[PDB]
Design a protein around this ligand. Structure first.
Ligand code: ETL
Length: 324
C-alpha cells in the first residue's frame, strides 16, 4: 500500500465523474495491456479577468461593459496504473465563468491549456482516452448549466512545455491542421452522444450571432482576443473596430472553436450554476508556472516512461504534503 498514490488523492465530484467515464470505456474495450485511470482535480480557486486599458476606454468607462469578469479556474490531471506504479499522462487547465458572471462571458468555459505525455498503455487507446476525458468534461459542465465551451487549437513552439517539463524528444508536436482535425474528431464524437449541439469556427459563430460590437466577444484570461483588440485599438489610434475584428477572425477562424452545449430557448431559463465541489487552494497547481518551476528545480523530466513515473511520484508527494 502506498500512502502517496494518485488514488488516495482527495476526490472531487468532477474527478470521479471523469474517471468513471474513462474506466467504463476501458472495461468495455477489455484490453489486457491497460490499467486503471485516476482523475483528480488538484486546484480550484476563484479569480477575475481585468479588461485592459484600450478596451476599458472604449467600452468599460462608458458603462457598456463590466470592468471585470469572475471565473473559477481549475487544474486536473489523469493517471494510469502501469504494473503498480502511477503515471501522469494528461493535464488540463480550465476557466469557468459562472451564471453570476456579467455577459458576454456568462455560462462559458475556456480550456486554457492542454498537455500530455505520450506513455499511455496501450498506444492504440491513447487518443480515445484523451477523448473520453475531454468529452466527459463537456458532459459535466453542460449538466450543471454552462451553455458554451471554447478551445484555442494552439500547438506550442519547439521547447515550450505547456504543463509537463521536458517532453520526450520523440513526441511530435502536431501541426495546426492535425490538431484541428483531432479536435473535430473529438467534437464529432460528442455530437453523436448528443452532448454537443454543434460547433463552428469563431468567425462563422460570430456571424450567426449577428455580433456587431467587440464588447459582445467573450473576454478570457490569457486568450488571443483581448490582446488582439488592444493592438487593434492602437492601430485605430495611429490613424471600424468591428471590421478589424471580423477580419482577424476570418484569417484565423480555423484555430478557434466555439462549442455550443445548450442552444435555443433551453438556454434562456436556466437555474443558477452551483459547483458541488469546494475550492481547492493549491499553490503548486495555481497556473502552470509553479509546477514547471518545481520540475526544473528537482530535475524532474517527463521525457521517458521511467523518468515520467519518477516525476509522477514526486508530484504526488508534493501534492499530498501540501494538501496536508
Ligand atoms: O502536443 C502537446 N504537447 C507537446 C507534445 C510534444 C512536445 N515537445 N516539446 C513540447 C511538447 N508539447 C499538447 C499541445 C497541443 C495539444 N497537446 C496534447 O498533448 C494533446 C494532443 C497531442 C497531439 C495531437 Cl495530434 C492532438 C492533441 C494530447 C492531449 C490533449 C491534446
Amino acid at each position: 500500500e502506498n500512502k502517496f498514490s494518485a488514488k488516495r488523492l482527495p476526490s472531487t465530484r468532477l474527478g470521479t465523474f471523469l474517471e468513471n467515464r474513462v474506466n467504463d470505456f476501458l472495461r468495455r474495450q477489455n484490453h489486457p495491456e491497460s490499467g486503471e485511470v485516476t482523475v483528480r482535480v488538484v486546484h480550484a480557486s476563484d479569480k477575475t479577468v481585468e479588461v485592459k486599458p484600450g478596451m476599458k476606454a472604449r467600452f468599460v468607462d462608458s458603462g457598456e461593459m463590466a470592468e471585470s469578469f469572475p471565473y473559477r479556474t481549475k487544474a486536473l490531471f489523469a493517471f494510469e496504473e502501469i504494473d503498480g506504479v502511477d503515471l501522469c499522462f494528461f493535464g488540463m487547465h480550465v476557466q469557468e465563468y459562472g451564471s453570476d458572471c456579467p455577459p458576454p462571458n456568462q455560462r462559458r468555459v475556456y480550456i486554457s491549456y492542454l498537455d500530455s505525455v505520450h506513455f499511455f498503455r496501450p498506444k492504440c487507446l491513447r487518443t480515445a482516452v484523451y477523448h473520453e476525458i475531454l468529452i466527459g468534461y463537456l458532459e459535466y459542465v453542460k449538466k450543471l448549466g454552462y451553455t458554451t465551451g471554447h478551445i484555442w487549437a494552439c500547438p506550442p513552439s519547439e521547447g515550450d512545455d505547456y504543463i509537463f517539463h521536458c517532453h520526450p524528444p520523440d513526441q511530435k508536436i502536431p501541426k495546426p491542421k492535425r490538431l484541428q482535425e483531432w479536435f473535430k474528431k473529438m467534437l464529432d464524437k460528442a455530437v453523436s452522444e448528443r452532448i454537443v449541439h454543434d460547433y463552428k469556427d469563431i468567425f462563422k459563430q460570430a456571424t450567426e450571432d449577428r455580433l456587431t460590437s467587440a464588447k459582445e466577444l467573450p473576454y478570457f484570461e490569457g486568450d488571443f482576443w483581448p490582446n488582439v483588440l488592444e493592438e487593434s485599438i492602437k492601430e485605430l489610434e495611429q490613424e471600424d473596430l468591428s471590421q478589424k475584428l471580423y477580419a482577424t477572425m476570418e484569417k484565423h477562424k480555423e484555430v478557434f472553436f466555439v462549442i455550443r452545449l445548450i442552444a435555443g430557448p433551453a438556454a434562456n431559463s436556466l437555474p443558477p450554476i452551483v459547483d458541488p465541489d469546494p475550492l481547492i487552494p493549491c499553490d503548486l497547481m495555481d497556473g502552470r508556472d509553479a509546477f514547471l518551476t518545481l520540475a526544473r528545480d528537482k530535475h524532474l523530466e517527463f521525457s521517458s516512461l521511467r523518468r515520467a513515473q519518477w516525476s509522477t511520484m514526486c508530484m504526488l508527494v508534493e501534492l499530498h504534503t501540501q494538501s496536508q
